[PDB]
């Protein structure tokens, strides 16, 4: 009954240092729909993190798309925390730049 | 144009 | 080209909330255009696309009204499936329904839709024929000798096959241009340096988010030792996706990446450029 979401933690445009880009953390295959997300700079919560809507797909599963705003530097890491009934505790998943 | 549900 | 309309809905109930939330989203051709939440402070259906704006104040009020409608139908139904399946009381519970009508590139209905989910999992289902219901559980034979006396299937065949054809109708003349305009996919290939070389195959800015990436070598696509991702949202109404594979430095340009897109005229053909 539980299902446990898949992550994925990427850019909307190919990243280039110094350039304003929006970072996204995809969620999705989860079940129940309660879940919470938290976008991550250094290890630090970022403030304003924009939420898409409660949303299922034809399988039943649940998915959410969170995004913010960044300007991506050599030695920024950015990462995506979350938080689900399927999982003891949260996971992070860190941005990959190369894909 | 949303349904109803059969009551 | 073929459209479709669709309204998903669910009803949430938590271990700490007395009631639950419901929350119903209609879509046009996979894309969100109204939505409504019970969690809302004045809930109403509200609009998600701009040309749904366009529609009239006695529209809103009418949808609003089914919704609350609902909303009641759904927590009702919640709290028997609780005894169909003695689940004590201090859990979370979901219920989830899909149902709409789907036309062929004539504009005439292909099919109707209405299955409803508990717990993430099928519970019933009204088959094709819109007479005739499935369902696999032994809980849910209640449900199922209920609706077969009493044409709740009549009921539903008559929307699907009569509202949700002319609405949809509707909804397709008014947002005819964000609708209709499919986005072709934008690709290339990057290189990666390994042991041994990584070729990844992107796609980029595509609409609808269908997509098949392959990668071939003397006329082969490599079935396993390829990696890729979900198709995912860029977060702009496109889409993104990739496909990877792992091949000796020197050996590239021997490998091709197709990309297969209902926006092409034909599959894209593409090699690692310098």
Redesign the interface.
């Known amino acids: 009954?539980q299902?446990t979401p898949?992550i994925?933690v990427?850019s909307?445009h190919p990243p280039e240092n110094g350039k304003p880009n929006?970072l996204?953390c995809?969620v999705?295959q989860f079940?129940?729909?309660?879940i919470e997300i938290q976008m991550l700079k250094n290890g630090k919560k970022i403030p304003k993190v924009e939420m898409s809507?409660?949303?299922?797909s034809?399988d039943?599963?649940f998915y959410i798309?969170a995004?913010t705003e960044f300007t991506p530097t050599e030695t920024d890491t950015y990462a995506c925390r979350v938080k689900h009934?399927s999982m003891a505790e949260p996971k992070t998943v860190y941005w990959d730049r190369?894909? | 144009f949303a349904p109803g549900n059969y009551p | 080209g073929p459209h479709s309309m669709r309204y998903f809905e669910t009803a949430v109930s938590r271990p700490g909330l007395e009631e639950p939330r419901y929350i119903s989203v209609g879509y046009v051709d996979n894309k969100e255009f109204v939505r409504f939440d019970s969690d809302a402070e004045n809930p109403r259906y509200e609009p998600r696309a701009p040309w749904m704006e366009q529609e009239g104040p006695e529209y809103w009020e009418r949808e609003t009204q089914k919704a609350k409608g609902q909303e009641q139908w759904f927590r009702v139904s919640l709290r028997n499936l609780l005894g169909y399946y003695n689940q004590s009381a201090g859990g979370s519970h979901t219920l989830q329904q899909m149902s709409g009508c789907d036309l062929g590139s004539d504009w005439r209905l292909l099919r109707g839709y209405l299955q409803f989910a508990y717990e993430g999992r099928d519970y019933i289902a009204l088959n094709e024929d819109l007479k005739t219901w499935t369902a696999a559980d032994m809980a849910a034979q209640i449900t199922r000798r209920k609706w077969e006396q009493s044409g709740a299937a009549e009921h539903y065949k008559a929307y699907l096959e009569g509202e949700c054809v002319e609405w949809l109708h509707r909804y397709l003349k008014n947002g005819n241009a964000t609708l209709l305009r499919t986005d072709s996919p934008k690709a290339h290939v990057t290189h990666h340096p390994r042991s041994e070389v990584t070729l990844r195959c992107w796609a980029l800015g595509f609409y609808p988010a269908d997509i098949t990436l392959t990668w071939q070598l003397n006329g082969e696509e490599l079935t396993q030792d390829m990696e890729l991702v979900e198709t995912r949202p860029a977060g702009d109404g496109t889409f993104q996706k990739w496909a990877s594979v792992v091949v000796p430095l020197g050996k590239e340009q021997n490998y091709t990446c197709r990309v297969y897109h209902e926006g092409l005229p034909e599959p894209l053909t593409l090699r690692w450029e310098p």
């Open positions: 009954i299902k898949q994925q990427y909307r929006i996204n995809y999705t079940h129940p729909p309660h809507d409660m949303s299922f034809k039943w599963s798309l995004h009934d190369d894909m």
